[PDB]
Design a protein around this ligand. Structure first.
Ligand SMILES: Nc1ncnc2c1ncn2[C@@H]1O[C@H](C[C@@H](N)CC[C@H](N)C(=O)O)[C@@H](O)[C@H]1O
Ligand SMILES: Nc1ncnc2c1ncn2[C@@H]1O[C@H](C[C@@H](N)CC[C@H](N)C(=O)O)[C@@H](O)[C@H]1O
Lengths: 223, 230
């Protein structure tokens, strides 16, 4: 595992997410940014599967590490993992095509900010809010969808940038165990952090490899 | 039945009143399917974590009994996560509304600036089946049709921890007709009741504080029935 981590650094690995997490050694990942899929589902089956994912993330996180978990009663089962929920971030997407008038316009997704627990005690995450522009220092992030992304359900690069830049130094490992188009990986690389992704789709691995090749290494966050 | 007769009499006497009474006792005094809209922000403590949640489950279950079918309960949780126990209630969670207060004095840099409180929008469940809330989003300005409400705190309110009248107005106007009963079992300064009266709805509040009851009566007397939405 410790040797295998050297061989996992700056790679997009086509592999089941739980298998990949179990190959990582303890206290080896500084930051996780991810948006899990809907299914690889019965509600009970999905909860425990996501529960194994979160419990593995708690093991692999470094003390002071952070996991940012974008989800579309989720909090009912997320409480049951070894991870400690630290803050719930509100992602305001700006607009929504769902104009159904049975409810208020649902243009918000939650980003759960988890932190590692050692022996049942709550750590405080490494966090540098000063590194962000004022626009993103608050609990509501107004970030519109990234239309140029080829994945069916991605998140924007600047979303991962905010998570990575505030909780890492250069060279730290960033993990996305549901990498998809590789948005988290591209953000980490643009920020001179190391990256690692897991996905079951070799189509999306190829998508990430070509995305890496065809775009200049842009940073969206500003000073 | 004796209980039905007792609750009907209590409802008759309680209507358009701020009643100084324990919240659970007041709720159990109300008839089934008697309330169209609840807007409330519960206190931190009654009058441990396990006791608070057990107590709130009783409150929510009572609210489910007294809501009319298609009725709504708006439940602002001030600020392990509340959703863990809130889902055990007979009430059905329908949507979580994001109240953006605009700013916060807590500038502690250990987290993102926490200027958001949740407003849990519940609907009545009947025999384990969910209802569809009466809801008229067209009555709102475009500013309040989305799941985030930007509403700054009410500066002139004399209560230590109220919510603004326009918050209550949004909940009431979209889920009621004139004459419908609006309930706040934690009335405090009476913000919900003032909003209901300004909108020509019937109101009812419970709170253990005679001081806050007096606060409501004098607030109601010096207000001009202004509608903050309009
Ligand atoms: N069992 C599984 N193990 C690993 N990855 C999986 C599994 N099931 C689904 N996935 C992947 O999880 C991803 C979920 C996506 N919504 C992530 C998108 C990503 N945030 C992006 O920007 O592209 C999909 O690309 C799936 O291929
Ligand atoms: N057991 C109890 N039964 C009823 N009311 C209670 C009880 N314990 C506390 N309260 C009241 O609950 C209220 C909670 C307030 N934060 C509500 C404020 C209200 N939203 C306003 O705008 O003024 C306080 O006024 C308390 O007096």
């Amino acid at each position: 595992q410790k040797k295998k981590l050297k061989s996992f650094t700056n790679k997009y690995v086509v592999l089941d997410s739980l298998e990949g997490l179990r190959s990582l050694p303890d206290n080896s990942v500084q930051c996780v940014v991810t948006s899990p899929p809907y299914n690889k589902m019965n509600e009970d089956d999905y909860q425990k599967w996501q529960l194994q994912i979160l419990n593995e993330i708690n093991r692999i996180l470094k003390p002071g590490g952070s996991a940012f978990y974008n989800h579309k009663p989720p909090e009912k089962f997320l409480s049951d993992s070894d991870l400690e929920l630290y803050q719930t971030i509100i992602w305001d997407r700006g607009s929504t095509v769902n104009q159904n008038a049975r409810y208020f316009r649902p243009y918000v997704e939650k980003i759960f900010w988890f932190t590692k627990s050692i022996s049942g005690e709550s750590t405080t995450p490494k966090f540098h809010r000063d590194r962000l522009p004022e626009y993103f220092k608050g609990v509501i992030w107004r970030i519109p969808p990234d239309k140029r992304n080829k994945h069916p359900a991605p998140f924007p690069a600047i979303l991962a940038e905010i998570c990575i830049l505030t909780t890492t130094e250069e060279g730290d490992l960033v993990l996305d165990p549901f990498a998809g188009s590789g948005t988290t990986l591209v953000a980490a690389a643009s920020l001179k952090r190391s990256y690692l992704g897991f996905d079951i789709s070799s189509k999306y691995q190829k998508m990430f490899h070509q995305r890496l090749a065809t775009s200049k290494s842009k940073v969206h966050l500003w000073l």
